[PDB]
C-alpha cells in the first residue's frame, strides 16, 4: 500500500486538500462487500 | 451481479456479496507529528 497526504479527490483542479498526519501506527479492518469491474473487447470471439 | 448493460463492456459492473471478506490494513509506522506556527492562529502539522 501507498499513502498520500495532498489530495484532490473528485479531481477538481484548483483546489486540493492536504490531509494532516496520523500519530502512531495505523490499523483498520473492513468487510469487503462488493466490487467495480470492467470487461474487455471483441478480441477473440467466445474463446475467453 | 448488476450492470446497467453488460453487452457494453464500458458499463461498470457492480457486485454484491452474500458473505463479507475481511481485510486487515495497517500503517505500521509510529508517527511523530510536529505542529508548526505560521499564525496568528494558523498552524501546520508536519511529520516528525
Amino acid at each position: 500500500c501507498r499513502i498520500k497526504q495532498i489530495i484532490n479527490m473528485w479531481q477538481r483542479i484548483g483546489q486540493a486538500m492536504y490531509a494532516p498526519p496520523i500519530q502512531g501506527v495505523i490499523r483498520c479492518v473492513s468487510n469487503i462487500t462488493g466490487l467495480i469491474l470492467t470487461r474487455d473487447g471483441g478480441s477473440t470471439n467466445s474463446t475467453t | 451481479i448488476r450492470s446497467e448493460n453488460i453487452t457494453n463492456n464500458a458499463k461498470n459492473i457492480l457486485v454484491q456479496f452474500n458473505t463479507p471478506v475481511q481485510i486487515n490494513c495497517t500503517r505500521p509506522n509510529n508517527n511523530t507529528r510536529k505542529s508548526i506556527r505560521i499564525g496568528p492562529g494558523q498552524a501546520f502539522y508536519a511529520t516528525g
Epitope: 479531481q11 474487455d40 473487447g41 471483441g42 478480441s43 470471439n45 | 457494453n8 463492456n9 464500458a10
Partner: antibody, heavy 126, light 108 residues
C-alpha cells in the same frame, strides 16, 4: 470550435517505442473520451483504444494491448499515446478523435468520433 | 477489418450510389451503432452518419444511411466532385470494428 492538435511527424528505428501528443481545446476537456487511431498507408483504420480524462481510465484492443500507453494531462489538456516495440508494420498516420457526446451521456464511449487530430505520421524502417 | 465494404464504387456525377457494410449479428444486426466516415485523400477522416441514420450538424441532406438486417447501407444522392474520397463504415462489436474502405469516382 474545438481543436485536436497532434505532435509532429517522427522518423524512428524499429524495436523502439514512440509517443504522440494531442492537445485539445474548445470544450470541457475532462468530460470527453478520446480515441487514438492509426491508418497504415492505403489501409483501413486501426482503433488503438481510448482514455477517459477523468482519473484516466482506458481500454485498448487485444491486438494493440501491451504496446499502447495512453494518457492525458488534465492540467495541460494534452493526450499522450505510445505504441511500443515498433515494427515496420507499425508504420502509420496516428490520429486522436473525440466521441460525439460527453461521458455523462448514454453509450459513450461507442457512438462516433467527431473532432479529429491532424494525424501524426510515424514511420518504422531499418 | 471485421466489417466488409465494397472495394470501389463508380457512380455518374449527379446519380445516386449506395455502399454496403455487412457484419455478424454481433455488430450490425443486433446494434444501431453503425456510423460512417468520409476521408479525403491526405486528410483527416470525417464523421458523416451515426446511429444507423443520423447526420451530425454540417452534413448535407444528400447523405443518408440505414441498416437492413446484418447489412447496413450508405446512400448519397446528387453526387458532386467534392465527394471523390475514401469512405469507411463503423460498428461496435464489443471492441471497435471497421469497414475496409471504399473508393468513390466517376462512372461512364
Amino acid at each position: 470550435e474545438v481543436q485536436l492538435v497532434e505532435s509532429g511527424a517522427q522518423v524512428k528505428k524499429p524495436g523502439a517505442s514512440v509517443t504522440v501528443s494531442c492537445t485539445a481545446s474548445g470544450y470541457k476537456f475532462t468530460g470527453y473520451h478520446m480515441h487514438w487511431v492509426r491508418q497504415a498507408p492505403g489501409r483501413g483504420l486501426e482503433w488503438m483504444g481510448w482514455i477517459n480524462p477523468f482519473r484516466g481510465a482506458v481500454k485498448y484492443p487485444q491486438n494493440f494491448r501491451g504496446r499502447v500507453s495512453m494518457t492525458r494531462d488534465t492540467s495541460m489538456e494534452i493526450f499522450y499515446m505510445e505504441l511500443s516495440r515498433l515494427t515496420s508494420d507499425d508504420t502509420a498516420v496516428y490520429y486522436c478523435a473525440r466521441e460525439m457526446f460527453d461521458s455523462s451521456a448514454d453509450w459513450s464511449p461507442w457512438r462516433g468520433m467527431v473532432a479529429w487530430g491532424q494525424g501524426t505520421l510515424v514511420t518504422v524502417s531499418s | 477489418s471485421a466489417l466488409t465494404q465494397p472495394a470501389s464504387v463508380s457512380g455518374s456525377p449527379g446519380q445516386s450510389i449506395t455502399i454496403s457494410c455487412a457484419g455478424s449479428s454481433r455488430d450490425v444486426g443486433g446494434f444501431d451503432l453503425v456510423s460512417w466516415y468520409q476521408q479525403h485523400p491526405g486528410k483527416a477522416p470525417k464523421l458523416i452518419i451515426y446511429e444507423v441514420n443520423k447526420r451530425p450538424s454540417g452534413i448535407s441532406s444528400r447523405f443518408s444511411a440505414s441498416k437492413s438486417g446484418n447489412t447496413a447501407s450508405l446512400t448519397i444522392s446528387g453526387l458532386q466532385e467534392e465527394d471523390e474520397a475514401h469512405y469507411y463504415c463503423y460498428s461496435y462489436a464489443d471492441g471497435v470494428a471497421f469497414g475496409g474502405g471504399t473508393k468513390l469516382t466517376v462512372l461512364g
